[PDB]
Amino acid sequence: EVPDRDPEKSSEDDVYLHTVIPAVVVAAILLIAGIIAMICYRKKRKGK
Amino acid sequence: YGWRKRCLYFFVLLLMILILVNLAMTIWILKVMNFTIDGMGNLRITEKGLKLE
Amino acid sequence: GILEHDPFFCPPTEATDRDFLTDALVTLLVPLLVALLLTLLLAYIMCF
Amino acid sequence: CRFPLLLALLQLALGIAVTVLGFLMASISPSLLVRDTPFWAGSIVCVVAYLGLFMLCVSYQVDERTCVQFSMKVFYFLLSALGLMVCMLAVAFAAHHYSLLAQFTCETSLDSCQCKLPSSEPLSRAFVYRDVTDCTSVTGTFKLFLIIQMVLNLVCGLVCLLACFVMWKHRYQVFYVGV
Amino acid sequence: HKTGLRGRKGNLAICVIVLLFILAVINLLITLVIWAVIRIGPNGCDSMEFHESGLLRFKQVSDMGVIHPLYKSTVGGRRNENLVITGNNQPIVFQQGTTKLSVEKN
Amino acid sequence: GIYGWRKRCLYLFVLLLLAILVVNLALTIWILKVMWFSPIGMGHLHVTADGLRLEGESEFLFPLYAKEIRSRVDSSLLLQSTQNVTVSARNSEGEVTGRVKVGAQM
Amino acid sequence: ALPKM
Ligand SMILES: *[C@@H]1O[C@H](CO)[C@@H](O[C@@H]2O[C@H](CO)[C@@H](O[C@@H]3O[C@H](CO)[C@@H](O)[C@H](O)[C@@H]3O)[C@H](O)[C@H]2NC(C)=O)[C@H](O)[C@H]1NC(C)=O
Ligand SMILES: *[C@@H]1O[C@H](CO)[C@@H](O[C@@H]2O[C@H](CO)[C@@H](O)[C@H](O)[C@H]2NC(C)=O)[C@H](O)[C@H]1NC(C)=O
Numbered sequence: 001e002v003p004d005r006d007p008e009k010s011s012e013d014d015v016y017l018h019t020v021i022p023a024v025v026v027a028a029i030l031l032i033a034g035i036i037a038m039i040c041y042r043k044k045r046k047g048k
Numbered sequence: 049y050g051w052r053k054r055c056l057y058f059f060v061l062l063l064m065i066l067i068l069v070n071l072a073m074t075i076w077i078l079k080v081m082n083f084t085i086d087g088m089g090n091l092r093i094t095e096k097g098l099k100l101e
Numbered sequence: 102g103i104l105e106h107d108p109f110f111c112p113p114t115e116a117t118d119r120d121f122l123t124d125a126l127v128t129l130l131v132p133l134l135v136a137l138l139l140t141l142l143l144a145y146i147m148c149f
Numbered sequence: 150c151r152f153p154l155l156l157a158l159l160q161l162a163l164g165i166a167v168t169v170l171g172f173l174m175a176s177i178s179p180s181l182l183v184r185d186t187p188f189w190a191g192s193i194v195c196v197v198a199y200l201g202l203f204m205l206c207v208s209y210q211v212d213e214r215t216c217v218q219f220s221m222k223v224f225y226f227l228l229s230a231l232g233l234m235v236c237m238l239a240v241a242f243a244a245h246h247y248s249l250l251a252q253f254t255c256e257t258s259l260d261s262c263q264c265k266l267p268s269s270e271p272l273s274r275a276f277v278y279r280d281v282t283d284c285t286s287v288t289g290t291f292k293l294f295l296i297i298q299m300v301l302n303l304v305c306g307l308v309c310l311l312a313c314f315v316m317w318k319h320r321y322q323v324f325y326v327g328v
Numbered sequence: 329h330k331t332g333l334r335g336r337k338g339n340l341a342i343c344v345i346v347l348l349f350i351l352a353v354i355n356l357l358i359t360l361v362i363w364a365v366i367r368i369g370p371n372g373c374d375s376m377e378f379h380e381s382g383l384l385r386f387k388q389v390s391d392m393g394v395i396h397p398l399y400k401s402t403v404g405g406r407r408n409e410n411l412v413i414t415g416n417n418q419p420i421v422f423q424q425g426t427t428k429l430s431v432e433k434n
Numbered sequence: 435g436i437y438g439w440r441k442r443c444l445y446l447f448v449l450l451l452l453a454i455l456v457v458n459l460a461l462t463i464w465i466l467k468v469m470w471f472s473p474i475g476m477g478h479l480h481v482t483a484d485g486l487r488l489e490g491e492s493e494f495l496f497p498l499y500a501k502e503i504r505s506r507v508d509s510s511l512l513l514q515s516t517q518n519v520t521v522s523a524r525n526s527e528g529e530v531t532g533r534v535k536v537g538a539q540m
Numbered sequence: 541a542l543p544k545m
């Protein structure tokens with residue numbers, strides 16, 4: 001009793017998730033923050 | 049100031065052109081190597097050697 | 102006088118190299134046009 | 150003020166909820182990687198909310214308008230920003246794993262949830278799970294748990310973004326005209 | 329008074345610009361090192377060619393060391409020319425358990 | 435200088451550049467991690483001008499359409515198996531006609 | 541001249 005078959009399809013998905021995704025989300029956060037700041041920033045006249 | 053502004057603008061221009069050149073080279077590396085989510089297409093470098101697919 | 106059929110031995114055909122010229126032209130023209138537009142913008146608001 | 154207090158209360162509630170969900174994730178089966186259980190992000194949000202409650206108590210108690218108050222208001226703001234970033238990252242990880250898990254057929258084995266993704270050719274990725282009571286029980290409720298958890302971190306990230314936005318709008322939106 | 333970048337903020341801006349420039353230069357150096365080491369050129373990797381239909385095509389003298397065929401992998405000759413196995417002044421020894429077939433010298 | 439709208443455009447430009455640079459750095463790190471990069475070559479796959487080289491095993495799925503297998507100068511090529519070693523040939527019709535087989539005992 | 545984006 002010793003069966004051995006090798007259909008294993010290894011793929012480097014852990015590295016992609018650990019590396020690309022955090023920087024993509026950081027870039028998205030920075031972009032939305034910049035756009036919001038530019039739309040805002042002195043849209044209101046504080047009279048008196 | 050009339051002299052530091054030129055330096056700042058030139059540095060911004062150089063920074064951005066360097067970034068664009070680097071981005072183009074990296075995109076070329078990605079395209080010519082058939083990079084995908086899984087990895088280097090069929091090749092897969094492992095701790096003992098290679099593993100073609 | 103036939104032993105095996107093995108309909109799996111398919112050698113790679115006369116597959117010529119894929120034309121890198123078109124994609125290289127695309128990915129060289131995009132940054133070239135970007136740089137040209139940038140130089141025009143620099144001339145425009147640096148000289149005015 | 151009142152609105153920052155409400156935001157901090159919502160932050161603490163959502164942090165405790167996501168930490169409870171992550172603890173349940175860990176307790177169900179040790180078949181899942183540390184990344185797939187975002188309870189660390191929940192703990193980060195929890196300490197964020199603890200700092201927030203302490204902030205909104207001390208601001209209503211004493212020392213309201215000194216320089217150091219702002220000096221760690223900036224700390225509060227950046228900490229909430231990192232909380233939002235970690236929540237969005239957890240959302241992305243959960244979405245990727247759910248997308249992987251939602252388009253495959255699985256079968257049961259004697260002691261594990263051994264199965265493979267649909268494959269054009271007979272070699273493909275294989276996944277096995279610890280101590281599976283039934284492959285039709287863990288898989289079938291794991292998706293529901295994932296969806297609920299996704300909604301949880303989405304709301305938590307939105308709340309964090311609003312908390313970051315409110316104080317900045319307090320500072321850099323109104324400019325004084327008269328004197 | 330005056331408007332714009334006046335005091336410490338100008339120094340902070342110039343420091344941030346310098347730091348960003350340093351980071352960009354470091355990234356460019358890393359990419360250039362990659363290009364130099366792997367010999368990436370306009371014609372491709374210069375040693376392999378990742379075809380679209382999942383077929384690597386080596387184009388240089390390859391030293392694979394030890395080969396471990398696993399499944400559906402049968403060493404075959406190229407398209408309709410030959411399959412020549414040569415031993416550079418060394419015997420070519422087939423094997424199966426105890427059965428042998430050794431092409432030595434003489 | 436940089437009084438008004440120029441400042442609020444320069445800040446946005448710097449932010450966009452920083453985001454692009456961060457994404458590029460992430461891509462570079464991903465490349466450095468997918469390929470086990472060393473100053474000599476990818477992992478143990480040493481790369482030089484003449485060609486490739488290995489140090490260790492090399493698993494292979496699917497057929498291998500080599501042109502001419504050779505052997506090292508200092509060692510004798512030693513093909514091996516456990517069941518049998520089959521060498522075949524084909525006619526103009528792509529059919530097996532002659533074949534040698536190093537079997538279990540004969 | 542309070543500076544921000
Ligand atoms: C050299 O050895 C190999 C492996 O020991 C032999 O291959 C084996 O051939 C037998 C005979 O057909 C196969 O048995 C049957 O094959 C059919 C194919 O469809 C399958 O449907 C049956 O269930 C049964 O397995 C056997 O599978 C096959 N083994 C492998 C690993 O391919 C080969 O015949 C030997 N060559 C000579 C000349 O003796
Ligand atoms: C095959 O031929 C070579 C070359 O003649 C033989 O090598 C000789 O081996 C003997 C004893 O091992 C030495 O004394 C000679 O000096 C070798 N000759 C050379 C030129 O080096 C080899 O022995 C032959 N193989 C067999 C099985 O006879």
Ligand SMILES: CC(C)CCC[C@@H](C)[C@H]1CC[C@H]2[C@@H]3CC=C4C[C@@H](O)CC[C@]4(C)[C@H]3CC[C@]12C
Nearest residue numbers: 071075076078079080082083084454457458461
């Ligand atoms: C704003 C900036 C960061 C955008 C950068 C876009 C880059 C990362 C994207 C846009 C287009 C993409 C390419 C589009 C098509 C293919 C072919 C595919 O078989 C392999 C990936 C490859 C080669 C992609 C690699 C990544 C790529 C170059």
Ligand SMILES: CC(C)CCC[C@@H](C)[C@H]1CC[C@H]2[C@@H]3CC=C4C[C@@H](O)CC[C@]4(C)[C@H]3CC[C@]12C
Nearest residue numbers: 020024027028031078083084085086453454457
């Ligand atoms: C938000 C801005 C700043 C940046 C956005 C970057 C996005 C669009 C880019 C960056 C890297 C890119 C990936 C790079 C490589 C691949 C592998 C390819 O086989 C499929 C596409 C895929 C998975 C790309 C998808 C798009 C991608 C994620």
Ligand SMILES: CC(C)CCC[C@@H](C)[C@H]1CC[C@H]2[C@@H]3CC=C4C[C@@H](O)CC[C@]4(C)[C@H]3CC[C@]12C
Nearest residue numbers: 219222223224226227315316317318319320321
């Ligand atoms: C009336 C009360 C609420 C005003 C309090 C002022 C607060 C909200 C303001 C004053 C100064 C501001 C900070 C000034 C500088 C930085 C660094 C910058 O890279 C991102 C924004 C950040 C982090 C700001 C966040 C908001 C901030 C802390």
Ligand SMILES: *[C@@H]1O[C@H](CO)[C@@H](O)[C@H](O)[C@H]1NC(C)=O
Nearest residue numbers: 112113114115116117381407
């Ligand atoms: C090899 O494959 C290509 C596919 O692009 C085909 O056009 C060509 O005819 C094939 N060559 C032979 C000899 O079959």
